[model samples]
Target chain A: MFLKKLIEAKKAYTFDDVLLVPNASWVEPKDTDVSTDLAGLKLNIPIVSAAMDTVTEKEMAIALARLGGLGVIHRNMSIEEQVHQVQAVKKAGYPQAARDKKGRLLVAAACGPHDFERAKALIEAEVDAIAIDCAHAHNMRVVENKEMLEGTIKLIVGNIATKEAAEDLIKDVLKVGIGPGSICTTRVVAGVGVPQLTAVAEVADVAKEHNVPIIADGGIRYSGDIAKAIAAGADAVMLGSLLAGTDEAPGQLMVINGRKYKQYRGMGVPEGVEGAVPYKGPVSEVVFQLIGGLRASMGYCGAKNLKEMQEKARFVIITIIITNEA
Target chain B: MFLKKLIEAKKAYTFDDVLLVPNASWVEPKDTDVSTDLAGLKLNIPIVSAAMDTVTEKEMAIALARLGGLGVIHRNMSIEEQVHQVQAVKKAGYPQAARDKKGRLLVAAACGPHDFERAKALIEAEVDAIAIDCAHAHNMRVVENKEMLEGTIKLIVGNIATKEAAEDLIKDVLKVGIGPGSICTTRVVAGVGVPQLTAVAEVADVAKEHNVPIIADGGIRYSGDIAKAIAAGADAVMLGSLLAGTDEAPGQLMVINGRKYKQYRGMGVPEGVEGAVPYKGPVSEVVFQLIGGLRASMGYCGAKNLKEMQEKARFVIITIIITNEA
Candidate 1:
């Protein structure tokens, strides 16, 4: 999950430290392709709602599917509840929803390192994919689970941040991230983590060679960040905080002084803080803005698609923080 | 001053991020030699107090010299006050103090990039050595001043953190640091800083080849850090926060409730915070513990002197913060 050094100290970078240099582009913004085949799941916007208790559930999966994105229903509850959530999304009848040949919504469901029953239930529920969700997803335990569930369903294993970790993953889609989440405290508490951009780029270097799609799982704070991560070689990005307070998300909706808010958190060992974010309307509006931003960024690179943007991207490390004030 | 990447990213470790590996040793703790000659100044201990306004002055210089270490009086004040500080230390006699042939206590003074008058005045005062105090010391301005004052007095030019920076710093002694200070906020504001231990080792790599002694400055929180810095290849270590609360430091003493605290500040650009640290009794007591710790660490490395420890030393990077747990 997090980086632990043995001999040499290594440098890593995040989005805040780097900027994509404007390249000579001949393509128009409207012509750029925002779609991608992430681990064989064709996503129109190359985004996924995070499989967090408050982010992804039946409602979130349905909305994201309508937006041509995937959502892995979280598996924090009982196996039956998780399967029911997946079934709800699959059964829901989209503005251009990602669907199967049978005209049903496509969905993904999550399982733990050894959640065999959860995996079997999710498979039985006919989820398009099952993500073996874990903090340090490069461990042997994850591999054992992935092997156990092999050929049962399309598998997405992750949250890692290293090239070596990506190499070990060997999943249909490798999920990449360690910390860099809004609610995450792993970086400080463990002094561990490869900065998100560096993690994506480093993992992409290896993941590309293997032809395995790598999903950047966290740290996408803005729409521009989606373009940055893809340019740095992520096939897609998974979002938690960004989609948590939306109407389609599953967090507890509460009102204060005529304003509404929703609760959110990351799972496991209490490394993430449970908190509330102000309501942000619906997931459709959020995905629309995000996809719109990515389109404009692609226009900057003159890229007709993600492949060209990734190839055309050149970056510089901005060492000093700049401010507007004198 | 800060890292700006050109091609590949490199790893750097800090004091807290690393721990010196203890080796099988035949040497006793008391047998280790803490004495060293830094930049032509012979001292019983390889330690120097920082040249910050509230940390070093006549009192600090005198007391540090008495304790067999050196002190560089800060130059944030007027040229006259700085020279007077040197004069005061030189004229004051002490118990087993590091001194010149005349039996007067030894003293060093600081100067800035264009502080010609301050440099000359200190030289005229016959100070033992002069330090070219700068944030980024490898620049032409520092070199120009160093060239101007080349043979007039022994010179100590510094604050650098890279091998290239050290390569550019052809001086009597090189001071290495970038951020990693208790009061410094540069890391967040500027996104700059090589970790302290890594800076020391990297700078020392080049400094050792040139036979130029390098001084490790800042990020030293405890006595164990002093040993770690030296083991990583510092000829000497300069301290600010550790020595700031002492009776010998220049910080303003203020009473808080039933206790007392002293003021401390780092000069220029407001990169450092002006705050108070609780009083830490006399400098002698602080110095004693530090030297004792180094002595034990030396014994652990099976070395009787710093030169041997630097070679015999092995290190490991501690990525996670360990805690007492269930």
Candidate 2:
């Protein structure tokens, strides 16, 4: 008789699958500090605009930087185009005086494996960091690339989903997203991923051991999700669709059914996947609401800062009922 | 730098975050046995109709029992209304003579913590069971209530979400739900609840120890959820919204936006959280689809019965993308 196969790291989860349990708090939502560190750069807020064609162009990056979060310029464009976007973001003033010490607007540019030419160009352009973007990051190519580029600039390598993967990558910032984005079809298309909450927790364990930081990338549906990710041990979170509907986003407005809409497409949409969302005016308002929600979550957890939120947070695995209604 | 904190139970998941990993199986969906034991009563299928105003009434209870599952008469109505409901259900013949050894359709009526008058009425009316329904079931009053009425009938008490809470109650069939119902707002309104998957696993641990069966009460959005709940350690699951869309559900049919719809309301709608859904044809078709899905789930897990499915089941926590489109 054949023995039954068992996966040792069996249990996994995502943001929607859990809820933050509220506790008696002396802190108020407004009083909580959302600041976090990313690849040795300090962010005034814990939110990062994801590097997607529909989300982070030059203007969107500038606006996000103005709101205290960095935006990684998408790699879909040519290297010159991406470097120009980074330069345009640098033209915008840093949100806080503390950020000035880093001598830039804290912009990050996205690139693929061994795009040494793109990496060198962004670094030469004085971009704060380079995110070595990929669909699966557990492979040796990422490890070697990260090692090869370690001291050249602040390196953020990612799109990984497990502890061993994170441990293998030699970088301070690990961009953690595996098939957890609104427009993403990677999980279904490739059948490869770990749920975001579990992925963050797994990677965070390794990151913490190395005193590194974890950027929870994609699958952020709302502000509560950001709180859940941070509490799950992420230093910060990346946003795609949440930012893509805004005016500052790269897309032009189109009228659909007598209502204004913004087009949002996955990076792999040519494989056939895309949608439209109602045009929400101004990225600042969206940022405000997101930060507001995070603060509210932190307040409920009695946390005055990210660290405290991470320490004091206790989550209640919630029903789809609560998540659906909310 | 100080090391970051890691939650030992770092990952907790829910039904929506996971999919059962399929294994080689000789069993087909039609060959699977969906039967399960609730309290001391044996059900033909591992499904229950929820005791929500919009879901179960006398006719619906009879219909559910006819389909080999139990349906609870809601307690929100007057005592007379509830008693008459149980009576009406008992008047309907059990669908199969094979169920006779367990005796008649297992009609159940709901009551509050101290509603002994209603309990006595249901018992006198020959109702098979009485559910001591409460938003929170881990209290002294529930213990006293259950203790006072132990010999009267098969008593099911609950709406709780923890193992500590389960251990406190001396129950045979514990109704496991808290802020997880489709229309229930307890999590948001009161900010109290555990995630259903985690809650079931936690409570199931204690329930197994006590030789008790746990009824996973609410938040079942689809048939896959029922499988997930059972795999996470629930004997059965209760459905509200799933049944609420059926033609037999308590509601008036209306056309909205050129489409037929059924009015669905929460038991606590006036307490202010409510929504509606499109009208689904018949309850039988819905029940059939659900059972079909569960049977297919069992087949995938390589089990021929609910208990074996539970023992053999393993899940892969997936991303939001999979849950959304799949």
Candidate 3:
């Protein structure tokens, strides 16, 4: 209700841009028990598809790792075009369950200029790690281009949000995903931000004293803001444009004034517009049915994965506000 | 983070469907100024465009009331076709800035068969309100379709998430807008929901002495959820998929596995694949860029409208979990 009051109520009023709040209800519609693992990877659904350039590349990151979840990819092209978009999301998955078997995954980039030959072609195509990002990683030319492409492999830095870029990404990273407070206007067209639940409660309390894992990235919107970004501390979150505009991450099927949608961007946005031509990968079918609806939302929070839905989420200090005759 | 654990993580990894935590930070790079005002209308921004079927149609609700904030339409279709979509959003705005231009800006019908001929075509196209909607409006077929569309227009019931459907919609509506919480799937395909900040703090305190104006629809993601849906007292806050994939709304722009997006639906969640269709409207560049980006997010929170940006929004309460040092 506040993206500039939904852009000042979409320019003062005319209404109707996307509002389908309908329902019938019965209940028993809880978290479906999708699988997950995060750090140590795994995942069947914790939802992660964003690496935008028009939403994930490499066959939408090998069809979101053949429907198990994990797409990342995008490096703003060139690095042999982000290594053929991570070898087309590892030949669009099923090349024997992806993430590595050449169905490669995890890529990130955006710090530009042959991002060290696109992180050495996603670690020579065995791909699995690399993030650097830099929406504003506390400047210094994006931490010296993420420490000159962190010597060239094993990545995860991210669009840092602050608290000194989450303590210089936990002093040389293990995994850190910032940009929390990332309402992404590229910090108001190049300013900088930090609201992702207070940048994951400030570098997950200083990368939990060295064990390192921060991650949080953009302002997670739900799974209850990913259980308030794992209770405002974060250990892992990354995801982008909530898994890039459906139809499995690529794009298309828009059609205004008649109705029907599917589009999502923001690699710090800037599509070049007018006649178009930017977009890149993993774009439609409502992102392949939201990777199967985020694995039925980690099984309605019973979370048999993703670190037990970030440790069985429950937090409740909501404070006041309740009516219908209290 | 709770739509029943995101519909059980989309029913145990159906393959993730939607998860972009946050992106449209309500677009407001500079030239800010976003204006506001509710009862007297004057909204230059506060975000509304959400009547879904892919998005309002009637030329996108008269180009979202000619860029100022109003369009509500979506009865699901046909009440004389939603009164020709409120006579095409009153012949699409600009009749010297319409405002109740003989009324009708809040149609939204649903619950079956010409619910009293969609309240006599939105009170013979002079509707100021109607919104019955239902994910479970206290059953009995939406309380017998809100008692056969009680007193015609100026209604606004809901998918009502308990407290006995907000005390039976403040004992017969005046204005409510319920549908509980929505990231929408019609409660994971008609199962049901309720958690919009505990159902707008219990139906805006039993609709503040039946004075009406409840509308807190769905989980409205931010601006701290429009100041926690006006301190969980809601007076208005409908939105759907955060103004349905913006840039303009309504729909168009496909390009899967290569990304480009634009297609935001939810009409009742029926479409089970294969070129799904059923959205109609104008969405005038998503209602003049969401009423010029909610008057530039009410001039970057210095707020001047929507009740001082809902009293300079600030909720905060959240706790913390993940830890790596944030």
Candidate 4:
């Protein structure tokens, strides 16, 4: 049914000859004081910007953070560009954060021994958190990677689809996020995939047993989806497209049909993976734009912060017309 | 029902365990092709920054025109400032218009009779279109006051409720825009207002006999609404809020809920009257803010230009949600 709905129209926009989709309005209302604490980092809104090459470079991530949301840094670029990109995003926001403060640290994650040397360099910059990225964590590589971590490292593991795996991998980990990003076809192209709903539910069930936090990642199209992910048992939701094409996002403006749109593609997609086979073009001047949809989500939901939004959030399936209404 | 929606909910929130009034999505998906012609005057967009003390300053007016919208010169300022303001907007938009090679002129609308002289001065300084403003323009005072003109002088009649009242006004009037602005309380404060929907529907029916174009001014909250207004009877729509709170709006940074909003107001809103209120602080720093909702409306409709948007727009009656999930 979910797949069918994804492929077919769930409802007809009788008034406007269009298909309908669920909107942020469909999410059940909750406590307005929706603030959250993610890995001891507090936020007024649960929204976050994706770190896609099209979405974030450095400037955008900082803008997102300043707007009371976190921004993920992607691993799709050269090491130096990634590091400098992080620095740039951090520099764009909350200038007052450094007014009387001293130097700050940069955090990077190493999911396997193969990436440790790169992670070590970021740690030298004194990052605040180090989040590991693994599509299928809990392998020998993740365990060994955690063992090699230095003092006070925040470990993030993901792709855990059930309670048992969540418990096994997250007992001592700082955060866990599971996803299926838009471009990732490892599940479809490679036939190794799980819907975000079941995956988060399983991981959240395990974390609930231990009262530990879980970060739900990917497949988030709108704020309502974020709330749904939270309701499915994740402690926090990691997002990407929410911040693409924002004012602070990277890339030059491209006018299509007389409208400006920022371009973004998935790293797992054909156009995104240039280093891989069958690639021809350079990834310059690409950006994806979003018109403050997440902020509007926060304001409309009356969620002041991320945690409150999650705790009080509830999700229900609705016809697309509901989403299409306005 | 609206009263029930409002009274029972001073403010309907997404959660707070209550149903809510939806946030009016003002920005429409519009084409970025800003070039447009208004009453033979070329404009970038349908946006018109209001001539409020907190908004339409000389610089701001120029900025708005430069971005493809007109600036209604604020007659609230001194005559010199008003003339300077018109020239400034024209200069910013068409520096070449000052020379022989440039295109159409920016329409400058003054607040009242006293401001007419200032508009005249602007005409001498190379202003193209002059618009007169009167809350009750059908009255003889306004007709006589607006009588003299060498070039095209556009006259605006406010609070037009009935088709009879609109036709009673002088013949050859360029355009007519009725009430529906957020800052307008002429209906509430004086009970002298008409339902904009009905007013436009009626006046437009009559204006067809005269071949003179009619502009539906107020009660427009979105691009869809603007389109609906045009279909109902208006040839064009004159707006301030639609263009006021944009990045290129009149004022500097206006932070609201940590995001920026532009300020705007109506001309006859008591504060719009002369000496009605004394300046107590740096006027530019007025705590009052004018929210720009139209851009969102434009974004959602996916319109790049007014003509195309009008051709494809539809309207919906907004209803407050009865419950959080409603």
2 or 4: which has the higher DockQ?
2
lDDT of 2 at A100: 40
Better by DockQ, candidate 3 or 2: 2
Q: Show where candidate 3 strays beyond 4 Å.
A: A1-77, A80-117, A121-131, A134-154, A159-206, A213-326, B1-154, B157-165, B168-199, B204-214, B217-283, B287-326
Model 1 regions more than 4 Å off: A1-10, A24-26, A93-95, A149-151, A254-258, A320-326, B1-195, B199-326
Predicted model with the maximum DockQ: 2
User: What TM-scores does chain A show, candidate by candidate in order?
Assistant: 0.92, 0.91, 0.29, 0.67
Please state the error at residue A233 of candidate 4 in Å.
Answer: 2.7
Model 2 C-alpha lDDT versus the unseen true structure: 0.76
Worst 10 residues of 3 chain A by lDDT: A10-19
The TM-score-based order of candidates, best leading, equals: 1, 2, 4, 3
Candidate 3 docking classification: incorrect
TM-score of each: 0.55, 0.55, 0.30, 0.39
lDDT per residue as tens, model 2, B75-186: 8888778878877766664453213244567778788877767777778888777788865565444566645455576778887776667777764688788657767655
What DockQ, on C-alphas, does every prediction get? Answer: 0.03, 0.06, 0.01, 0.02
Q: Write the per-residue lDDT of candidate 2 for residues A1-326, one digit (tens) a residue.
A: 23334544465777666666544456765577888877568888887878878888888877787788888889998888878888787776434422546565668888888677888788888888788888777778667774446547677888898878877886558889888877787767777678888888888877887778999988887777888888888899898788887998987688878999888887753422678888999998888867777876676566899999878777654331121232
* Interface RMSD per candidate: 12.9, 8.0, 17.0, 21.4
Give the Å shift of residue A128 in candidate 3.
Answer: 17
Q: Could you tell me how far off, in angstroms, the CA of residue A318 lies in candidate 4 after the best superposition?
A: 5.1
lDDT for each residue of candidate 4 in A181-201, tens digit (9 for 90 to 100): 654556555565456655665
lDDT of each: 0.77, 0.76, 0.47, 0.46
Per-prediction TM-score, chain B alone: 0.92, 0.90, 0.29, 0.63
